[PDB]
Every structure is written in structure tokens, then in C-alpha cells.
Amino acid sequence: FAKLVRPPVQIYGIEGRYATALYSAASKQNKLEQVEKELLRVGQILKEPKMAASLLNPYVKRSVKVKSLSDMTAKEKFSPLTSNLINLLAENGRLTNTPAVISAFSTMMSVHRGEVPCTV
């Protein structure tokens, strides 16, 4: 028993658009490095057992836990193109399957290089 198939998960659209709808502004600047490298942090933070008890703790609050995030946003890598996606990632509670959103960034971060007036 307990067979299960466990369908694949990594890319979809709505979740992938989150990064593309945040880095979209980042691209205009070229912070893909500060938003793609940062996004990688959110992935390791979820793998952290101790983090799971903080990134998903209903004991904190709706606007309280967001403050503690800054500590992981100003001492991890975030701050610029991730000092907004951080609150958004922990605004509704999408810090469970967020690692999938970061992956899309790697594919969306490569489409920005071609989507530019290549005259030089």
C-alpha cells in the first residue's frame, strides 16, 4: 500500500509569473542577479527545518512575521529586488511551494537577454 505516483512539479505559470511579475521591473534595471540569486535563498530557507517552524508559524501574525523577515532579507541576500517579493511570499502563505517559483526565474531570466534592442 501507500503506492502513490507523486506527479511532477516545478513550473506552471501563475506561480512562475510571480517572479516574472516582480523581476519584470528588475530586468529593466538588470537586477536579475540580485533577484535570481536572492530567490535561491528562499529555497534554502524552506529546506531549513528550523525555518519551517517560522516561515509557517501561525503564532506570529499577519504583519508581525513580515518584520522578522527583514532580518532574513537584510542578512541573506535580499533587500533590493527581494525586499518586496519577501513580504509577498509571506503575505498569503506561499512559502511552501515557493521553490517552484524560483525555478521559473531561471527560464524567465534567460528570456530577458533576448528581449532587448540588440543593435550594438
CATH number at residue 105: 1.10.520.20
Evaluate whether residue 47 is within a structural domain. yes
Which method resolved this structure? NMR
CA within 13 Å, CB half, 80: 15
Which residue range is the domain that position 91 belongs to?
13-116
Instruction: Tell me if residue 111 falls in helix, strand or coil.
Output: helix
Evaluate whether residue 89 is within a structural domain. yes
Evaluate whether residue 7 is within a structural domain. no
CA angle 92, 103, 41 (to 5 degrees): 65
Q: In this structure, are residues 95 and 56 in contact, taking their beta carbons and an 8 Å threshold?
A: yes
Which DSSP string do the residues of 12-81 spell out, in sequence order?
Answer: -SHHHHHHHTTHHHHHHHTTHHHHHHHHHHHHHHHH-HHHHTTTT-TTS-SSSHHHHHHHHHSSSS-SSS
HEC per residue, 16-35: HHHHHCCHHHHHHHCCHHHH
CA 86 to chain CA mean position, Å: 7
Q: How far apart are CA 42 and CA 51, in angstroms?
A: 10
What is the grid cell recorded at 36? 535570481
Evaluate whether residue 1 is within a structural domain. no
